[PDB]
Design an enzyme around this catalytic site. Structure first.
Site, short mmCIF file in Angstrom:
data_model
loop_
_atom_site.label_atom_id
_atom_site.label_comp_id
_atom_site.label_asym_id
_atom_site.label_seq_id
_atom_site.Cartn_x
_atom_site.Cartn_y
_atom_site.Cartn_z
N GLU A 56 0.81 -1.22 0.00
CA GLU A 56 0.00 0.00 0.00
C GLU A 56 0.85 1.28 0.00
O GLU A 56 0.79 2.10 0.91
CB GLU A 56 -1.00 -0.03 1.16
CG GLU A 56 -2.01 -1.14 0.95
CD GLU A 56 -3.12 -1.13 1.98
OE1 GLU A 56 -2.83 -1.21 3.18
OE2 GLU A 56 -4.29 -1.01 1.58
N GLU A 70 -4.45 -10.25 -0.74
CA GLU A 70 -5.45 -10.24 0.32
C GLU A 70 -6.82 -10.49 -0.29
O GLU A 70 -7.13 -9.96 -1.35
CB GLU A 70 -5.50 -8.89 1.08
CG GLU A 70 -4.14 -8.47 1.59
CD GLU A 70 -4.10 -7.13 2.25
OE1 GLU A 70 -5.17 -6.59 2.58
OE2 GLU A 70 -2.98 -6.64 2.41
#
Ligand SMILES: OC(O)[C@H]1NC[C@H](O)[C@@H]1O
Ligand SMILES: OC(O)[C@H]1NC[C@H](O)[C@@H]1O
Ligand SMILES: [Mg+2]
Ligand SMILES: [Mg+2]
Ligand SMILES: [Mg+2]
Ligand SMILES: [Mg+2]
Ligand code: NA
Ligand code: NA
Ligand code: NA
Ligand code: NA
Lengths: 1016, 206, 204
Positions: B50, B126
């Site tokens: 991220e 994820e």
């Protein structure tokens, strides 16, 4: 004030730590001036917000930084002197410059440097106006400091900078004050950055580029990038300007980007800040990208360097200008497509040269006048490209290349050549942060320059993973330019271009992990698709550039051979002074600098004062943009321009009969880019006199350009036309026989042949002797730098030609007289001689001669030479004598005005040439064989005339004195004129200078040799 | 995975596209590879999490590929299919439903494989966010993984609840999240996304 | 001893500078134990050349590194406590752990962090056998320090290291001595490395 002291600041030893390349240095960016007027930014008038601090500074030298006294931080040292900045302190005499090639100038122990680390303490008292401190940001810009430095301002420590070839900028706004200020800059010669700065050049130090103060507003343009995108025929362009600000974001803030051609504003765009959405968090609120459409933009190239002016205005929404910046824009697209490097859709042919920043008096300090002189000489000799070997140059260089038209390879300041192996640092991730700043700060500084077409990752640092990382970084940040890098074999994953150094045209050099294939072979290796452009080739060390035409034949024949960069532009000689004040050109260890690599710093096409070597004209001829073919009466002209029509070109043709002009004409060139023009010559006059007709064409530019005068010759070519062999037919000389000599009398004249030596020992015209040294065979030459074959002074190549000639005893060989008799014909006298040259009971050469002295005063000399096949092939086969005459001119029918060799003669032309005798000696700084002219059918010197088909040189220096003298200023003119007339002369080589480089067809390997000469 | 997440930046790649932060990011990647490159269990390197997509990611991707070619490199940031990843590795891309966000869309994982010019395998770094009573629709993922060859699975978010124990005034422990320590700003119960409780007792989703 | 002081060492503010991620840190490498017996290395028995310093350390918390008194470099603070290492000091009650997802736990202004920067001063008195100092190299290995730290050994400054998830190793061979030694480790909660550590988890 404890933390500002030298005892605290020097204790971390930041110059022995690759994890600290700077402290408190500002971000890199394109060149700024902070114009507060948009019209001044558009016209590039000098900004009053950019102050130059060049000039007189106070300077003290210390042998280590620990020897600097603490009081220097507050007040000027009484023992400090006044020196000009920018400068290198070695040029002021404070310590010696060091010339070392590969071997580092310090002990290899990275990241540590010697405790004896020469330290230059510079200081400057300067006034700052109080309007700079009440608002805005005042930064100091050091464009170049070698090699590392700490900075104090008013006794307070500011920061620390590394990389001696990119600007180091520091915010001084909290340090300055109204009234007198004082900088204190402590410059260290050696740092951990010195391990990345092992370029083959003089090792100098100091504040050697500009120092400047720049005042910006607090809300400011902090960066701007200019991209140009095109359609497939380049008829519509989009200029994309990305502008970044620093400072308070206000909703009234605006950026206008305007595009100007000359005086007409072509495109404008106005936008508030705010980028498009970048990811999940959003976009840059402090950036804005403007897109301007340009219909039919004038494209930039080296042939036609069309420039626009972009102005970037930071202004409020009600129209108040805050700050302007600007840059020249060249619309061009550089791309590799289907294995070829294209510029504006057309495949480039790179006529390149490597260029160090070198001045013989100022060392490594560059000035605009020398930059402009280099660029003009480069363009006048048909170069279109320059490699920045091996570092980012002075910022003005790219501007001048934008404006005059040169393609630039901009190269990071990374060379770790002295490491073992070469990639010991570049494969280490501990050195990845230091290498990353040398690459990224170069791209951030220079990415808006149109002349920069290729990025280079550095030079001679092996191939490590750091190279692959920084390659990919540049490809992500700037996709508009290819990346190249030679190291680790010239074709690694870190290069878009196969870019070998000194790969030969036809001969492989199969080194174990980094082979240099022949460039033709390299292109077709399985899985190889990239273009090939030699980053270095044709090593111009001294009398060199032999075989240069073979490269340019290969470049023109093979599409993916797109040229290369000659090593190199200018000799790195420095001036020293003799005890009477006379300057002389110095190399290597002439400053007490050891270890050194002697004359290997001088590899230039031009001398350090920018006077051309003779090789430069060979470079001009092979690189010429017009190519010629003679069918029968028709000249076909081919243009190698990609973008311009031949609109400043006039073909002059001339037909001569062995020097004498018979016909001549003028024809305007009217050839498209990459096109052809047929030129039919008129009916040539078929002469009656014997001899060879020669056709010579030259392209002249009738109009001056920005880089050349009116009447500049840009290209030429010569052909043999029809030949008419002579079949016309031509007292009696008296022969005295003594036991010691044969003497031939005819009229006033005499010829004397020593019967014990077997040589013509003396000649008489009137009462006066003509020779100081007997006419004798000569098989050696004073060795060129290519013959000597050394690139590191400590390592001798036993395969070097001079090593082989010396070990064979060519320079020591003694002539053994075999035969010498005399016979009186019924119209002449015939002397017959035979000599054997031997070294330790081995016969190297046999020379058989006949001298025919007729009643017409001629002496016909016939020489048949046998060379043993097992001796190394001799440098020459000819005759040599010391003439008693010293005449002023040399007159002769043969190749070229300039010096030309069998390996380097394509630029020469056959004609009658007449030069002063000093013009027949080429003053190479390291003296060698020089001044030869090939293809000579007649030579005139004073009252003497030699005819035949020979090569000659003529000068006041014997080959022995040239071989024994290390510097050209140590030569002394000998009493007469030394004449060398060669039937046969070896090529000079020059593919490199550290291995045997004379191609096999240019070696004197035939074993038996014949030549005839007539002396009159 | 390298210790690099710059999620709170605006935009997310503000540091990772800055060459001033390339030396700091380079040490988080290179020192991880130098430490762990002999372990056989490590099969894939990750550039972090991220942090958008910046040029520093492309550089460090290529570094790892040069230094250790024996392991693929993946990185989700900047849209899960950049030049800095060998594997299409989206977070929470759905099986059948596109989520067409403006510069970083999360295509349905079946659709993502067949986009023009896309050839890499897809492994969700994820998926199936196990926050509390969750893992609904988990069987739809595993039907898709078994049917499609280049859908090679993924990594559930995540293993263990990040609850911490506090104590009431009588001494009884209790599981605390977010702002139960006076910490502020906090994000409350969003630290508990586990298949198991913090004491490793299984949730029903396991 | 001026250069080892907190007034000098903290003045560069190395935790607010992405160009300084470490000072004097050794190179990274695979896990080492330095077995002097090949059979012990093969069976992975515990090496006596690899010493564990986990256990009881002395610990003092300060609200900023400037509040750390200079005497802590030489002797243990009387107000310091005995805490188990390894640990996170928020689990011992010294300040609160913070759970923030995306929003950074400090003001976004890189590379700067707050002046209120919670500082854990750890120290350990430990014996070194004299056979370690007569030959060889003795290095200290911190497998994980969050988020940045300065290191002193016997009052002399050793180095600095960032990245809270990889080992930081320092050569102690010139700093140790026979008899009692003392480490002093000043651990900062926030640094410029905290901008690269914005994972959705507890900030400890
Ligand atoms: O790459 C260049 O700098 C080097 N190659 C040979 C040349 O003389 C120089 O030493
Ligand atoms: O990438 C992970 O760390 C983040 N994705 C969602 C998850 O709850 C976490 O915040
Ligand atoms: Mg350093
Ligand atoms: Mg070199
Ligand atoms: Mg830091
Ligand atoms: Mg996150
Ligand atoms: Na070609
Ligand atoms: Na050289
Ligand atoms: Na599958
Ligand atoms: Na979460």
């Amino acid at each position: 004030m404890i933390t500002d002291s030298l005892a605290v600041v020097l204790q971390r030893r930041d110059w022995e730590n690759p994890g600290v390349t700077q402290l408190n240095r500002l971000a890199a960016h394109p060149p700024f001036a902070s114009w507060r007027n948009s019209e001044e930014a558009r016209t590039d008038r000098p900004s009053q917000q950019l102050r130059s601090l060049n000039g007189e500074w106070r300077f003290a030298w210390f042998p280590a930084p620990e020897a600097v006294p603490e009081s220097w931080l507050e007040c000027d040292l009484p023992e400090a002197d006044t020196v000009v900045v920018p400068s290198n302190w070695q040029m002021h005499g404070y310590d010696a410059p060091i010339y070392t090639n590969v071997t580092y100038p310090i002990t290899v122990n990275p990241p540590f440097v010697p405790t004896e680390n020469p330290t230059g303490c510079y200081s400057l008292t300067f006034n700052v106006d109080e309007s700079w401190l009440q608002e805005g940001q005042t930064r100091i810009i050091f464009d170049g400091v070698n090699s590392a430095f700490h900075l104090w301002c008013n006794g307070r420590w500011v920061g620390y900078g590394q990389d001696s070839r990119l600007p180091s900028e520091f915010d001084l706004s909290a340090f300055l004050r109204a009234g007198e200020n004082r900088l204190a800059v402590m410059v260290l010669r050696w740092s951990d950055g010195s391990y990345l700065e092992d370029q083959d050049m003089w090792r100098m130090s100091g504040i050697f580029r500009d120092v400047s103060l720049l005042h910006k507003p607090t809300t400011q343009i902090s960066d701007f990038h200019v991209a140009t995108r095109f359609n497939d025929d380049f008829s519509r362009a989009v200029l994309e300007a990305e502008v970044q600000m620093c400072g308070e974001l206000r909703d009234y803030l605006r950026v206008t980007v305007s595009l100007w051609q000359g005086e007409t504003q072509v495109a404008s765009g106005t936008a508030p800040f705010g980028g498009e959405i970048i990811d999940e968090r959003g976009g840059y609120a402090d950036r804005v990208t403007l897109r301007l459409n340009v219909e039919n933009p004038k494209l930039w190239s080296a042939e036609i360097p069309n420039l626009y002016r972009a102005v970037v205005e930071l202004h409020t929404a009600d129209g108040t200008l805050i700050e302007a910046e600007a840059c020249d824009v060249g619309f061009r697209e550089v791309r590799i497509e289907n294995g070829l490097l294209l510029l504006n859709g057309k495949p480039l042919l790179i006529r390149g040269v490597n260029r160090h920043e070198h001045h013989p008096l100022h060392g490594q300090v560059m000035d605009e006048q020398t930059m402009v002189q280099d660029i003009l000489l480069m363009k006048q000799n048909n170069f279109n490209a320059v490699r920045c070997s091996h570092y980012p140059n002075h910022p003005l260089w790219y501007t001048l290349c934008d404006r005059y038209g040169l393609y630039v390879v901009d190269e990071a300041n990374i060379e770790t050549h002295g490491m073992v192996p070469m990639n010991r640092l570049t494969d280490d991730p501990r050195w990845l942060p230091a290498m990353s700043e040398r690459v990224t700060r170069m791209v951030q500084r220079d990415r808006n320059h149109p002349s920069v077409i290729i990025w280079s990752l550095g030079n001679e640092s092996g191939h490590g993973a750091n190279h692959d990382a920084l390659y990919r970084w540049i490809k992500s940040v700037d996709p508009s330019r290819p990346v190249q890098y030679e190291g680790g074999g010239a074709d690694t994953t870190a290069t878009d271009i196969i870019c070998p150094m000194y790969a030969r045209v036809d001969e492989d050099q199969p080194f174990p992990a980094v082979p240099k294939w022949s460039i033709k072979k390299w292109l077709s290796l399985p899985g190889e698709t990239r273009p090939l452009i030699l980053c270095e080739y044709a090593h111009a060390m001294g009398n060199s550039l032999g075989g240069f035409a073979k490269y340019w034949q290969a470049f023109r024949q093979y599409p993916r051979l797109q040229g290369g960069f000659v090593w190199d532009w200018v000799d790195q000689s420095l001036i020293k002074y003799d005890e009477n004040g006379n300057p002389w050109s110095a190399y290597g260890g002439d400053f007490g600098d050891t270890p050194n690599d002697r004359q290997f710093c001088m590899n230039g096409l031009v001398f350090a004062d920018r006077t051309p070597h003779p090789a430069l004209t060979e470079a001009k001829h092979q690189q010429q943009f017009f190519q010629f073919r003679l069918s029968g009466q028709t000249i076909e002209v081919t243009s190698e321009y990609l973008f311009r029509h031949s609109d400043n070109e006039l073909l002059h043709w001339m037909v001569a009969l062995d020097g004498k002009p018979l016909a001549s004409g003028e024809v305007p060139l009217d050839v498209a880019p990459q096109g052809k023009q047929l030129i039919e010559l008129p009916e040539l006059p078929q002469p009656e006199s014997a001899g060879q007709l020669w056709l010579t064409v030259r392209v002249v530019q009738p109009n001056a350009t920005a880089w050349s005068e009116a009447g500049h010759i840009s290209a030429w070519q010569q052909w043999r036309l029809a030949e008419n062999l002579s079949v016309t037919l031509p007292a009696i000389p008296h022969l005295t026989t003594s036991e010691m000599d044969f003497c031939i009398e005819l009229g006033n004249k005499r010829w004397q042949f020593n019967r014990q030596s077997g040589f013509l020992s003396q000649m008489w015209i009137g009462d006066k002797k003509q020779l100081l040294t007997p006419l004798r065979d000569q098989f050696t030459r004073a060795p060129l730098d290519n013959d000597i074959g050394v690139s590191e002074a400590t390592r001798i190549d036993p395969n070097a030609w001079v090593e082989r000639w010396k070990a064979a005893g060519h320079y020591q060989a003694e002539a053994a007289l075999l035969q010498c008799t005399a016979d009186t014909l019924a119209d002449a006298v015939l002397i017959t001689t035979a000599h054997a040259w031997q070294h330790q009971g081995k016969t190297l050469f046999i020379s058989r001669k006949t001298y025919r002295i007729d009643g017409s005063g001629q002496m016909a000399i016939t020489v048949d030479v046998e060379v043993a096949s097992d001796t190394p092939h001799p440098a020459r086969i000819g005759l040599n004598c010391q003439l008693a005459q010293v005449a002023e001119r040399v007159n002769w029918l043969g190749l070229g005005p300039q010096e030309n060799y069998p390996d380097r003669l394509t630029a020469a032309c056959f004609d009658r040439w007449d030069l002063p005798l000093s013009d027949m000696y080429t003053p190479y700084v390291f003296p060698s064989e020089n001044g030869l002219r090939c293809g000579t059918r007649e030579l005139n010197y004073g009252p003497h005339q030699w005819r035949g088909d020979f090569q000659f040189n003529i000068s006041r220096y014997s080959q022995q004195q040239l071989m024994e003298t290390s510097h050209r200023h140590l030569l002394h003119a000998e009493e007469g004129t030394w004449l060398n007339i060669d039937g046969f002369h070896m090529g000079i080589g020059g593919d490199d200078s550290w291995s045997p480089s004379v191609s096999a067809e240019l070696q004197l390997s035939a074993g038996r040799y014949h030549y005839q000469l007539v002396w009159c």
